[PDB]
Amino acid sequence: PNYKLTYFNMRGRAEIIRYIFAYLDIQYEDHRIEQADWPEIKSTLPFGKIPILEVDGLTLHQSLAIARYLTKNTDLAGNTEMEQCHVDAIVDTLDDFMSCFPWAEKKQDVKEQMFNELLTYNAPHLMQDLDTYLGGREWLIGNSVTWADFYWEICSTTLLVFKPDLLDNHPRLVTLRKKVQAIPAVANWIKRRPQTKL
Amino acid sequence: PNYKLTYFNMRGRAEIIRYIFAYLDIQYEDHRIEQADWPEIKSTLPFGKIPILEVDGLTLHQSLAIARYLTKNTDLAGNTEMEQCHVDAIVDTLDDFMSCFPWAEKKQDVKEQMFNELLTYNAPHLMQDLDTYLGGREWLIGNSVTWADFYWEICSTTLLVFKPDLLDNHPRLVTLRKKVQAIPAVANWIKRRPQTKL
Lengths: 198, 198
Ligand SMILES: N[C@@H](CCC(=O)N[C@@H](CS)C(=O)NCC(=O)O)C(=O)O
Ligand SMILES: N[C@@H](CCC(=O)N[C@@H](CS)C(=O)NCC(=O)O)C(=O)O
Ligand SMILES: c1ccc(-c2ncc(-c3cc[nH]n3)s2)cc1
Ligand SMILES: [Mg+2]
What we know:
Two copies of one chain form a homodimer.
Chain A: E1 3-8, H1 15-23, E2 29-33, H2 38-42, E3 52-55, E4 58-61, H3 63-71, H4 81-98, H5 108-134, H6 147-162, H7 171-182, H8 184-192
Parallel strand pairs in A: 1-2
Antiparallel strand pairs in A: 1-3, 3-4
Helix pairs in contact in A: 1-3, 1-6, 1-8, 4-6, 6-7
C-alpha cells in the first residue's frame, strides 16, 4: 500500500499520523507544502482541509480518523473494547482543547490575547484532569502504550512551546512524555524530523 | 450491560448515542439533569463534561468516543476499516463545525450575530461539500446506513432550527435526513423522545 501524507511543514495535526507510521515501521511520502501552494490543492479536496492521506489512490481526511484507521488491529489500539473507548475519549479531550486555539488568526494582537487566555486560564485545568486520570499508572490507557499517549506527548510539546512552566507541578505527566519520547521508533523520528516551531 | 446515559434535557451531544441505542435495540437509562443537579455530578466526573455513559458502574466520556464504542462490530460502524475511517472522518467534520457555534454565549446580540455569520458563510460551504460527497448515492458511506448518516440528520436538525432554509438548495441532503428519519427504530425514537429546542 502506497502512502502519501500531505500537510503543512509543521508537526501540527499531521504529527500523530507521522508517529504512528514510525512506530509500525511503515514507509510513506511525507509531503509538506508551502502556503503558496495550498489554495490550489484545497480547491480539489472533498473537504478542503489538511492533513489528508492518500492510500492507493483514495484520499482520506481528518487527522484522528486517519490515526484511528492506521492503529486499528495494532498494539497502539486499546487492548479491550472499553480501552479503545478511553483511547478515543482522551484523544478527543486533548483535541477539543487544541482546537480552541485560533491557529489561523491573522490579527496578531487578537491571536496573542486568545492564546494567552487559553494557556493561562484553561490549560492548567486540563493538566490537572489528565494528571488525576493517569494517577500512578504507566500509560494513560491500560498496561501498554496506545496512540493516546502519542497524542498526549504531541499536544503537550506544542503547548510547552508557548508555556514552558505548564508541567512544573505535574512530574507524572513529564514522566509520561519522556516514556513516549524513549520508545525507539519515536525517539528516531524525533531526532530526524524537520525542526519546526509548531 | 446496564447502561446509564447522563446529559441535559436536550438532544445536543447525547442524541447520537440515543439513536445508536434505539437502532441497535439496546436498553439503557436515559437520565437527564437540570442545572441544579449539575455542580454535584460535575465534581464526580474526571473531565467535568457531559454526556457520560456508565456501563456496569464504569464511567465513559466524550460523545463520539461512546457512539463509536457502541457501534463496534455492527454494520452501523462501516463495513470495512476504510469505510470506518470515512465514517469517522464525516463525523469529526460535522462535529468540528458544530463546535464553532457559541452555544454558551450570554450576550444575546453577539450570539445572534455569530450564528448568522456561521449560517451565512460557513454552513453553505460545508453543505456544498457534504452534498457533492454524498452524490446521488443512497448513504454517506458504503451500501448501508452508518452512524455518520445519523450524525448528519442530528446536526442538520439542530442547524435547521436557526436557518430553516439551509437545505432549500440541497434536495439530496434533505432526502438523506428523510431516509434516516424513516428507519423504524429511529422513527419510533424521534416520536418518543422529549421535545426540546436543541
Ligand atoms: N479536525 C481537522 C482539522 C483540519 C484542519 O482545520 N487543518 C488546518 C491546518 S491545521 C487547515 O486545513 N487549514 C487550512 C485551511 O483551512 O484552508 C483534522 O484534525 O484534520
Ligand atoms: N467534545 C465533547 C464535548 C462535551 C461538552 O462540552 N459537554 C458540554 C455540554 S453540551 C458541557 O459539559 N458543558 C458545560 C460545562 O462544561 O460545564 C463531547 O462531545 O462529549
Ligand atoms: C493538536 C496538535 C496540534 C495542533 C496544531 N498545531 C499547529 C496548527 C496550525 C498552525 C497554523 N495552522 N494550523 S494546528 C492541533 C491539534
Ligand atoms: Mg473532535
